[model samples]
Target: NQCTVQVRLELGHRAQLRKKPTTEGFTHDWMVFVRGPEQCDIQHFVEKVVFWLHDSFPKPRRVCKEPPYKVEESGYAGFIMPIEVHFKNKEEPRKVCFTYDLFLNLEGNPPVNHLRCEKLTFNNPTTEFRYKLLRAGGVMVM
Candidate 1:
């Protein structure tokens, strides 16, 4: 059966993710949040899915990798744009992706809204490595 999960803010769920000044968390764009059924692999969940970033800005701010699933960006702080997520299932290898608008809070008052549940289809690693590689050019040889 296919599944869907709601996206949330790490700070809303975990206070520890926040930096000293609230704006500091904004610096890192805080962390992206996703939840699934209790029995599944969080490591797997974090490792596979993809988080597409907004492209209007000059700086690149993509969010992916389960790392328990988080993001590191402070640039696009608003209902910036819809974030695309490609979830690859273990039982099957034929899953595409879904979209959701990301909220990177950088100003007064945390967002009162959150992203709705997009389908969780969440991949493989070579793609991930290649992504990191392309971004870092061997500087991040994970």
Candidate 2:
């Protein structure tokens, strides 16, 4: 009785292209810089995030990568991508990247002053803050 395949259009997808994010006790802390259209106060947006992550946040946690947001849970588990965020002030979002390696050191509070930021924002909605990056480093081209 039944057949499903033009070029194999109805079998099963071995989908596991990219594994999603996972965070636990030591998921590690990182910084994100959101840049704007320039001419912005700049300071406003930067401070906002600090207030939040500490109120806390996502892998933007995405801006998800479409359906099957999660795969291989057995019974059922999935979420669609691109959750929206709304900031009160709309100053040209300035993007800043300060290589701040946040961690649960031997025993010490976060080094806020070390960073160029006014306050500390820690927004991680999930247990472990999740995100992705395309890392490529094997050779150096001149």
Candidate 3:
């Protein structure tokens, strides 16, 4: 029987005010992350999460190597950011990518929060990989 495992990717942003508002450009904090439902801990199957920032950024590629796999930064504008998840033990393709459009509350709503969640799937994994996936927390689909 071929089994499938699913994981959730989260992207979010929020506005913030600096003590001394020097630059009107630095408006909010944005981030991208990975997680699972309830008690699912994805660390056993995933090695790291990578976030590709804008070219203007000092180091455009950011990586998170542990649980709560995430990359965060303060920014002024919204743009299409690319994210990648690297699987543990080089399973199959070994990694996957997600494109996220970071959003800011341009309207008058400073309290409004912006977020998105996407699901990723691994199908018919090898026995060793499948065990780690289930051990890390997963619902196997037949």
Candidate 4:
């Protein structure tokens, strides 16, 4: 199903640190991607993605708490959006790549901290990641 809607990127933790800990105490930024049917509503879609990730991959015990983080109206292309999940721990930050295309060759023995999907040869260079709501067609309603 195809639908045009708003997409949001959120960064959070399971527990909140009372005092900001050093790099040794907590895990830091973790990167994740959302993959689904090519024509899903971006807004509602992200909520589902968050739920899935939380259920599938719970963060490490060191994570203090989940902070309320959000990005609204994230203009995403296709039915997928790639998000970088940031944590406080330097040694181990949760990393999960959904697919090769979704990971965009960024996966390796030591994962790359930053990912550039637009720079890849297979991706559409002209495709701009906008933060707007647009109407499109697919099979979302069905």
TM-score per model over all chains: 0.42, 0.18, 0.81, 0.20
Whole-model lDDT per candidate: 0.39, 0.22, 0.70, 0.26
Model 2 per-residue lDDT tens digits across residues 17-136? 122224433322332233222232322222232212221233223221222111121111122222122223223222222222222212333422222222213222121111110010
Q: Ten residues in a row with the worst lDDT in model 1?
A: 8-17
Ranking by lDDT: 3, 1, 4, 2
Pairs clashing within candidate 3: none
* Clash pairs (backbone) in predicted model 1: 46-66, 66-69, 87-122, 88-122
Ranking by TM-score: 3, 1, 4, 2
Scored by TM-score, the top model is 3
TM-score of 1: 0.42
Residue runs of model 1 more than 4 Å from their true location after superposition: 1-28, 42-47, 56-66, 79-93, 104-107, 111-115, 118-142
Q: Per-residue lDDT for 67-131 in model 3, tens only?
A: 77666677667778788878875458698787877665554556435667767678888888777
Q: Which numbered prediction scores highest in lDDT against the true structure?
A: 3
Give candidate 3 misplaced runs (Cα > 4 Å). 17-25
